[PDB]
Amino acid sequence: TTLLNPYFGEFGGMYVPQILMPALNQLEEAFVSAQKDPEFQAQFADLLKNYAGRPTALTKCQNITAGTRTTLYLKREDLLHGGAHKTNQVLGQALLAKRMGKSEIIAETGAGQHGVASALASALLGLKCRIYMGAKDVERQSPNVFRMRLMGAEVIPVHSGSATLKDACNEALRDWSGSYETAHYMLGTAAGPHPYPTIVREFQRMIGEETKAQILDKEGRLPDAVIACVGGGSNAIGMFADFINDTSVGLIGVEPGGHGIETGEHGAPLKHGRVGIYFGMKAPMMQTADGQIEESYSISAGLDFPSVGPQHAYLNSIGRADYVSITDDEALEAFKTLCRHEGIIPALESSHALAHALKMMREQPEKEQLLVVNLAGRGDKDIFTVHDILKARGE
Amino acid sequence: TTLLNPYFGEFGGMYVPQILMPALNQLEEAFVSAQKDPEFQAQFADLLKNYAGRPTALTKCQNITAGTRTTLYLKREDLLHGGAHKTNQVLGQALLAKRMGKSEIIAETGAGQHGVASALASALLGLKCRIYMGAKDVERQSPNVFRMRLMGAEVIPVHSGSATLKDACNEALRDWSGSYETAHYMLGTAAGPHPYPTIVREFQRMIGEETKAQILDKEGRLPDAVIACVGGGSNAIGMFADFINDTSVGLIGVEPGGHGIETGEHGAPLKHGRVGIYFGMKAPMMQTADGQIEESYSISAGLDFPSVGPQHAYLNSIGRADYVSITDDEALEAFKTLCRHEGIIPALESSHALAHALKMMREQPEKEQLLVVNLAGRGDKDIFTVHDILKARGE
Amino acid sequence: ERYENLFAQLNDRREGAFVPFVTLGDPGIEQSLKIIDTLIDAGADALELGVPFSDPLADGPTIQNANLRAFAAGVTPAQCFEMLALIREKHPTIPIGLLMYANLVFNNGIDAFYARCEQVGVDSVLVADVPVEESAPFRQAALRHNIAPIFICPPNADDDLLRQVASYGRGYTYLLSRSGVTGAENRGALPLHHLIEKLKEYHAAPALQGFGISSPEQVSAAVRAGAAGAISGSAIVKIIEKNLASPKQMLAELRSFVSAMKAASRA
Amino acid sequence: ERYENLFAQLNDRREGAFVPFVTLGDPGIEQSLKIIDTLIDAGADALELGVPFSDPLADGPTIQNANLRAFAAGVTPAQCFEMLALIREKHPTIPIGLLMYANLVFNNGIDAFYARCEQVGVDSVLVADVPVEESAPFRQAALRHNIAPIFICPPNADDDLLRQVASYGRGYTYLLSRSGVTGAENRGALPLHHLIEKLKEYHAAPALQGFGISSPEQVSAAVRAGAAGAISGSAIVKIIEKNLASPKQMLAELRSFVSAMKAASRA
Numbered sequence A, B: 001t002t003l004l005n006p007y008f009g010e011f012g013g014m015y016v017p018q019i020l021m022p023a024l025n026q027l028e029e030a031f032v033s034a035q036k037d038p039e040f041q042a043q044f045a046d047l048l049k050n051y052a053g054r055p056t057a058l059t060k061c062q063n064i065t066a067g068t069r070t071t072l073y074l075k076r077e078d079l080l081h082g083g084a085h086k087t088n089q090v091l092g093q094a095l096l097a098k099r100m101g102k103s104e105i106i107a108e109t110g111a112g113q114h115g116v117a118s119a120l121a122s123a124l125l126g127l128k129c130r131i132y133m134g135a136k137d138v139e140r141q142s143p144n145v146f147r148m149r150l151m152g153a154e155v156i157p158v159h160s161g162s163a164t165l166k167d168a169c170n171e172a173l174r175d176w177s178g179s180y181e182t183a184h185y186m187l188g189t190a191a192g193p194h195p196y197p198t199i200v201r202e203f204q205r206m207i208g209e210e211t212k213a214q215i216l217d218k219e220g221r222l223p224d225a226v227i228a229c230v231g232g233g234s235n236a237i238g239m240f241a242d243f244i245n246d247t248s249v250g251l252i253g254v255e256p257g258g259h260g261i262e263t264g265e266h267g268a269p270l271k272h273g274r275v276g277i278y279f280g281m282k283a284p285m286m287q288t289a290d291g292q293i294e295e296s297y298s299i300s301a302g303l304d305f306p307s308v309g310p311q312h313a314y315l316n317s318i319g320r321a322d323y324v325s326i327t328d329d330e331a332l333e334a335f336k337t338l339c340r341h342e343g344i345i346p347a348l349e350s351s352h353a354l355a356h357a358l359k360m361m362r363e364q365p366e367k368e369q370l371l372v373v374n375l376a377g378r379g380d381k382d383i384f385t386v387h388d389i390l391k392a393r394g395e
Numbered sequence C, D: 001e002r003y004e005n006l007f008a009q010l011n012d013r014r015e016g017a018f019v020p021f022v023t024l025g026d027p028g029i030e031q032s033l034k035i036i037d038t039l040i041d042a043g044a045d046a047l048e049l050g051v052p053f054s055d056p057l058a059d060g061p062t063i064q065n066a067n068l069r070a071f072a073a074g075v076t077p078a079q080c081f082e083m084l085a086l087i088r089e090k091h092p093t094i095p096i097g098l099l100m101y102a103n104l105v106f107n108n109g110i111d112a113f114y115a116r117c118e119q120v121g122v123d124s125v126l127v128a129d130v131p132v133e134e135s136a137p138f139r140q141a142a143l144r145h146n147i148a149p150i151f152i153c154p155p156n157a158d159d160d161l162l163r164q165v166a167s168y169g170r171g172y173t174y175l176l177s178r179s180g181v182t183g184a185e186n187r188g189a190l191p192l193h194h195l196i197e198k199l200k201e202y203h204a205a206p207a208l209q210g211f212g213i214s215s216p217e218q219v220s221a222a223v224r225a226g227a228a229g230a231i232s233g234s235a236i237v238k239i240i241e242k243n244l245a246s247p248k249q250m251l252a253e254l255r256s257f258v259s260a261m262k263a264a265s266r267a
């Protein structure tokens, strides 16, 4: 029994061991309570403004669209403290942990960004933070691991399974299964068991709310479409939520196409996977024929996960949102384009969203369209990866 | 003959070859004109808000001052696009270049941050950008060099003299001496010949103006002191300018003490150098006994320069501002402290300012004092340097 | 029916059930089949058998490693079902329960999963990541195919949960020793006799205590508290892990351990 | 007085002045002294001599490298002044002008700098990074010590600048060939006869054209346009750079070059 529907249509639910159900029920109640609590909301707003730096800019990108009938704005989550949108929801989850009387945080991370965001919120708010990270990810993300440790978090390598993000997700839940009376699990995306898809959306919805106000102020109308990449679904649902009832506004989610859909080396389960049950939810995933959870792939670590949040699968099924893919090479081109034409270095994740917008513009350059790309992160973290690819190409 | 006084007391002036005097006169006129031009001001405000993300947060740091009578705020220039305060003035200088009908930018850089800021402004505003950088700096700042090149700037190693920042400064002026009809020199600090100390101050003064409004709103009074590190003087004068006439407000500038003043391995000319004439100005510098310009030193590359802007030397001489030094080890401690207690990774430059504030607090923990540190940059760029020091120490 | 028959016979002998867990195909198919026959010959009353899965999020490191060993041997669910058919073909009456994760059950259709269980002669299925709140399509498919759905009764169960588990479950009720995940390294720390009594009041399937059972005294304790018996997994699997280099010593130690644990069920 | 005497004598011979520049102590003190004596013996009418400085921001790469060579040889300003005293002790009447940067003049006091110049027998000082706008304390100290302050007349000089340079300067007026920094690789591209005429109208010190002069035809061109002569630096220094490995060939080539350049001043 729950306060809120755990499902979006057929997708979602609460597929956790029985032992964890009280943990989820407690969290759901504390969330519903917090959402009615002016004191909670004021504390959250205070952190978002004075610590994280909200509101974020909405930047008009004139050079990149010159000589077309596209007007493109970028919502600048890359300017948020931490350099990605994740900071918004970790602040809210940290406040929920305090609300429930917990003093410890558990988090999973793959690329390391969620680990950093969890650690920073925990440092600020006086919570002990332990982060699980697949050993292969620990090996490849030394900079982020060091950042987590500077902020006083414990970083725990996970050697089980495939030693990557899904294995870290498992380990986080294993720990929580035995510690939830004292520790909160700060899940890093709008996926997993209810109530996380709901909470993460609500704690990211300021992205779309601000975008709506800013676009009305600047253009006097709503956008024709808003475009965001989809790793687990948080930045995208944060941009989308406030526009869901504005049915003239297109909602476009971009999954990583990796080396190409046809190669099987991608991270696009919503459109190219198969519904399964894993990480507490019924959702599209990448899996073997006999139902083992598969290895995902993207040039961008932030996108490299074999599933997707349930609200995206739902919005897709009813045709409210459209989902597309962008390959490594298309993302790389968009990355280089933004650097050179706008003086902004985007996250390779965000480069997927921008790449799709550039395709919308280039394919139909005489179509009048007002687009917003959610620039969810900056790309300083990616310059080594990009350097190494460009070098191998002899560019 | 000039429109404005080129001197602050005895410091400053226009010590350039005769050939460059028309370039300086033109720039001064264009600046004075721009400062009266509502259209210029609106364009500048538009870039600062919608592209750079102004206004920046003022963050109250409660964990770090617990159990003392210090209240500490950080002015969050680390959240500005580019991750340092330099973005503010490069936008204004780029607009001046356009005002004068120039389509090319020349810039010097040492640490590489000014190079990045110059390149980003140039990319956005359609200007060709060439950056001079001492070959030794090019070797040690591969990440920033790559960032400049991604944004389409040309980066030109300088092999003359000591192959570092002063040598890059020389080369920039050499180039300008032969190109000023078509190119603007985007000098990177509030130093050099008039009118640069004036222009850079005015294009950074929003830091202090916002700080004043934000502190009045939050505390109902002006700060007891505002504290900023001093590399060439830009972030500090930007924080100070709006408070100069508020004579109850302390203005504290922090020079890098390096391995210690007594070792001679530092970058603190204002207090430990000797007045000289170099880089177009009469100012304190680090020099040999026979007047060769000396090698400066700091753990932080952003601070490692053997001179200082003339307005600082002036404010010091009249006793309006006080200047102090902080050593590498004190800066490192402040860096680690902020990461762990506030979840903010500061620039090693900014860590010097924070270190002095922590000393003000710790030395006199029962003194009621309201301090603002100008957090001029974020420290992602520094985590390798810090890692390597902590490792050598076996921490 | 196999559980009902077993519990009635054990009741007549005033005995608890001793129920080992192993991962099917750990460390390979052939050695796994020998392991399982050894467990039975040494006195196992029933079996709990895991199908190797990529993401066993209710399992501690011992059983994580068992899954990894089976994968290293190339063991697939299809091969596991071949194994199960052969196990039942060898042993007519022993109850065989599977420990599953939801995706393996859902993968080719929930109904078809339980139909295959019925075809090979499985008796119960416990899906570790499906709580009672989500159990409806699993328990329905189970019962349609004469498979007992196994429900978990946690130490912190409220009355409504006790009533649900009592009502929907068949075969046995899983009585969790403690919070956390499987492992012999963590022993249960709470008396469970109250839950056992409430389960009996509500006519639940007989309780088997599981998690952290690694010693004869814990088996006897389970029986003394009123449970019908006890499950031991990690302790068994550790013997496999320890003895990978000597299949002969492995089987010897498995025999001694199961024999001792079964001896403790007298009471 | 040495400049006034030289220009009067050259006027009588209808000759231009040829004035080489070298860096003092490039490539070492002893070879530098031999270089300078060679320049004189081959027909230099006056000298421009640079004191090695860390930041020569009016100089292109050729003279940047000359400064670096002198530093590699450990040459200091004090040693340069010892050299200058010896040069004057050898040559009574040749005008000796220094090319300085402001910090070297300011370092131990402006007045003391020019007092030392007077003591060693220097005739003029050009401070490359001090424009007329900042010149007052330098020109005053110069004149107090009987040193000619050398002012730069750029190609883009307005009337006020011409009047200032004419009024404050002594010895010679430096007539810049072009924008940019020293170097033989860039030739001046503008006729300067108008500036030369205006300087004469205003009773300025005689003009020497400098920057990018590397060829006899440029010397003759300077004289034909009405200038009193021409300065050549980078072209001279390149001969040093080219011949570091053979001091004998270096001096031979310096002699041939200066001889040819001086020959061109006939007119």
Ligand SMILES: O=P(O)(O)OCCNS(=O)(=O)c1ccc(OC(F)(F)F)cc1
Pocket: A017, A018, A019, C021, C048, C049, C058, C059, C063, C099, C126, C127, C128, C129, C152, C176, C181, C182, C183, C184, C210, C211, C212, C213, C231, C232, C233, C234, C235
């Ligand atoms: O002896 P241990 O501690 O290794 O425990 C044995 C466990 N083996 S099992 O198949 O009963 C079993 C039963 C339930 C499990 O998870 C769940 F409770 F969430 F459903 C996991 C494994």
Ligand SMILES: O=P(O)(O)OCCNS(=O)(=O)c1ccc(OC(F)(F)F)cc1
Pocket: B017, B018, B019, D021, D048, D049, D058, D059, D063, D099, D126, D127, D128, D129, D152, D176, D181, D182, D183, D184, D210, D211, D212, D213, D231, D232, D233, D234, D235
């Ligand atoms: O032949 P080149 O092109 O090497 O030029 C020779 C220059 N040697 S110099 O001492 O006259 C000389 C004169 C003026 C200089 O700069 C200034 F104009 F700014 F003052 C620099 C050098």
Ligand SMILES: *Cc1c(COP(=O)(O)O)cnc(C)c1O
Pocket: A084, A085, A086, A113, A114, A188, A189, A190, A229, A230, A231, A232, A233, A234, A235, A236, A302, A303, A347, A349, A350, A375, A376, A377, A378
């Ligand atoms: C984490 C991250 C993503 C992917 O995660 P979502 O939950 O799908 O948003 C995408 N972009 C950036 C910049 C991220 O930091």
Ligand SMILES: *Cc1c(COP(=O)(O)O)cnc(C)c1O
Pocket: B084, B085, B086, B113, B114, B188, B189, B190, B229, B230, B231, B232, B233, B234, B235, B236, B302, B303, B347, B349, B350, B375, B376, B377, B378
């Ligand atoms: C560039 C820089 C400095 C030093 O330069 P100033 O002109 O003195 O401000 C200090 N801090 C940061 C973060 C910088 O980027």
Ligand SMILES: N[C@@H](Cc1c[nH]c2ccccc12)C(=O)O
Pocket: A108, A109, A110, A111, A112, A113, A114, A115, A165, A187, A188, A189, A191, A231, A232, A301, A302, A303, A304, A305
């Ligand atoms: N791998 C990214 C984003 C992420 C965190 N948790 C996730 C869960 C599912 C999908 C993506 C994520 C990070 O750790 O920063």
Ligand SMILES: N[C@@H](Cc1c[nH]c2ccccc12)C(=O)O
Pocket: B108, B109, B110, B111, B112, B113, B114, B115, B165, B187, B188, B189, B191, B231, B232, B301, B302, B303, B304, B305
């Ligand atoms: N070295 C720093 C700051 C800087 C730029 N120009 C300067 C001139 C003087 C002193 C410091 C600077 C950078 O390049 O980013």
Ligand SMILES: N[C@@H](Cc1c[nH]c2ccccc12)C(=O)O
Pocket: A178, A181, C154, C155, C156, C177, C178, C179, C180, C188, C189, C190
């Ligand atoms: N600490 C014991 C007992 C316990 C406390 N709170 C619990 C909640 C659920 C289950 C058990 C417990 C355990 O984790 O098992």
Ligand SMILES: N[C@@H](Cc1c[nH]c2ccccc12)C(=O)O
Pocket: B178, B181, D154, D155, D156, D177, D178, D179, D180, D188, D189, D190
């Ligand atoms: N291009 C030539 C002529 C010239 C054009 N504009 C100038 C301004 C100043 C001096 C010279 C010039 C030079 O640089 O010399």
Ligand SMILES: [Cl-]
Pocket: A008, A009, A010, A011, A314, A317
């Ligand atoms: Cl649906």
Ligand SMILES: [Cl-]
Pocket: A007, A009, A010
């Ligand atoms: Cl449903």
Ligand SMILES: [Cl-]
Pocket: A035, A036, A041
């Ligand atoms: Cl709300």
Ligand SMILES: [Cl-]
Pocket: A035, A041
């Ligand atoms: Cl609300």
Ligand SMILES: [Cl-]
Pocket: A140, A141, A142, A143, A384
């Ligand atoms: Cl990396």
Ligand SMILES: [Cl-]
Pocket: A142, A143, A146, B383, B384, B387
């Ligand atoms: Cl590192």
Ligand SMILES: [Cl-]
Pocket: A149, A150
């Ligand atoms: Cl650390």
Ligand SMILES: [Cl-]
Pocket: A159, A160, C065
């Ligand atoms: Cl392992």
